[PDB]
């Protein structure tokens, strides 16, 4: 970062933003990853057993990335409009 004594770029520019502490427990699961879960039910603990999310993850969201291979039930897991359509197209369903 030393620029010869000129005001460095890492001090000419302003600090901005804040880090989100609420986003440290969240993870995103692709639709291509839902078929790698065991037991036909996609859940918080079942995604941890499949090693698709970390152990500390407490809330999961599914977004459309890849194709849902097999019909699975999403229990307590949020999804996007595109992901929800793809999951239900393959025969899946959602539970609160």
């Amino acid at each position: 970062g030393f620029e010869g004594g000129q005001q460095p770029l890492h001090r000419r520019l302003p600090k901005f933003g804040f880090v989100s502490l609420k986003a440290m427990d969240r993870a995103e699961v692709r639709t291509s990853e839902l078929a790698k879960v065991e037991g036909d039910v996609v859940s918080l603990q079942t995604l941890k057993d499949a090693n698709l999310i970390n152990q500390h993850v407490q809330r999961v969201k599914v977004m459309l990335s890849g194709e849902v291979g097999r019909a699975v039930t999403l229990k307590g897991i949020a999804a996007t409009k595109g992901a929800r359509a793809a999951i239900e197209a393959a025969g899946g369903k959602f539970e609160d």
């Binding site: 970062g1 620029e3 770029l9 890492h10 001090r11 000419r12 520019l13 302003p14 600090k15 901005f16 933003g17």
Partner: protein, 63 residues
């Protein structure tokens, strides 16, 4: 030991897919004399210039 990121650089340069974002200078405290166009075009983030990437990439411990 493991490399220590410069705290000040990490507070001014966010890494996104596409470069490092940063705010603009000259938007802090002398703003009446500045035109609205100048203040509006100095608002928002921006990608790091090509010549500053390696230097900042080294300030952060990403290289």
């Amino acid at each position: 030991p493991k490399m220590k990121t410069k705290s000040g650089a990490a507070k001014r340069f966010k890494k996104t897919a596409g470069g490092l974002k940063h705010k603009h200078a000259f938007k802090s405290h002398i703003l009446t004399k500045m035109t609205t166009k100048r203040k509006r075009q100095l608002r928002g983030t921006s990608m790091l210039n090509k010549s500053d990437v390696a230097r900042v990439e080294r300030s952060l411990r990403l290289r």
